[PDB]
Structure 1
Amino acid sequence: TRDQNGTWEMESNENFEGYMKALDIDFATRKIAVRLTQTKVIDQDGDNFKTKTTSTFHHHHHHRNYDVDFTVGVEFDEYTKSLDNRHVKALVTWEGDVLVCVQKGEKENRGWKQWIEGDKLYLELTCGDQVCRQVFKKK
């Protein structure tokens, strides 16, 4: 299914460290991120998406919020203020039922793929030779 609507609560996050390192995020910031959790809210109307990803940290007094809206097939600008603070040109497409984002810029293989299995949302974030695998359950 391509229907990704819902509120999604993180159940696992593997190799977020390596993904952050591939984006050149500094040591202190990666350390703050250890064992964070997230809730991701997706409001999807066909190819039109509004998404809000809220990170809650283990030992930091505030959340971070990464909200991205897009239409499949329509390139858009991203300013990754809560990650590596770069400007990329993002394009989201479908590969079958997999939602695929390429973040065009200097880094090779930068983007993500997101798909549904049962009541779970899978997200694989990529940069360079690093893959971060996340799983969320529908709330």
Structure 2
Amino acid sequence: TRDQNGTWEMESNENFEGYMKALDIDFCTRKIAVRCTQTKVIDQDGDNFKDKTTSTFHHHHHHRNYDVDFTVGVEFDEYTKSLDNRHVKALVTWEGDVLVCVQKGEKKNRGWKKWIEGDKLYLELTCGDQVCRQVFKKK
């Protein structure tokens, strides 16, 4: 038969990494590719083809949670799962209306600052000379 019309869900996929290596895809892109499911929607009219393929990434911990409880001024041990899984000794204090934390440990100049402005929560995470700024909106 020649009629390839339909919606097709991938059922089996073998030597997908061998083929991608032959095309020089890097290790990381392959590791993301083999975690994708594929749907193919084929519209065929004689010898005219419309082939639409959808790759969906499926990562475990698609909804990962990280919980930290602390009191201002009370040093606590933090295990930075969700990031680098290191042990730091963390201490949170107020500097004005800015919540400031120092994470003493292997990394020097590691810590963060958290504050409110308007309807938004600002967070800046520091490690050495690298600052990451994140902004959150109130729901």
| TM-based fold match above 0.5 | yes
**How far apart in 1 are the matches of 2:101 and 2:4?**
15
- State the Cα deviation string for residues 17-69 of structure 1 (Å, max 9, x = none): 99999999999699989999999999999999999999999966622211111
User: How many pairs align?
Assistant: 139
- How far residue 84 of structure 1 moved from its aligned partner, in angstroms, is 0.4
In structure 2, what is the Cα distance between the partners aligned to 1:5 and 1:71? 62
Preserved CA contact (<8 Å) 2:35 2:59:
no
Q: Does the residue aligned with 2:17 lie in a helix, a strand or coil?
A: helix
Q: TM-score, normalised by structure 1?
A: 0.57
Per-residue deviation, 1:129:
0.8
- TM-score, scaled to structure 2: 0.57
Once the two structures are TM-superposed, the CA of residue 82 in structure 1 deviates from its matched residue by 1.6
Moved more, 5-14 or 103-112: 5-14
Deviation (angstroms), 1:85: 0.7
Change (3 A) 1:88 1:41: farther
| Cα distance between partner residues in 2 of 1:5 and 1:98 | 60
CA 1:61/1:88 → structure 2, altered by over 3 Å: closer, same or farther?
closer
Q: Which has the higher contact order (CA 8 A, sep 6+)?
A: 1
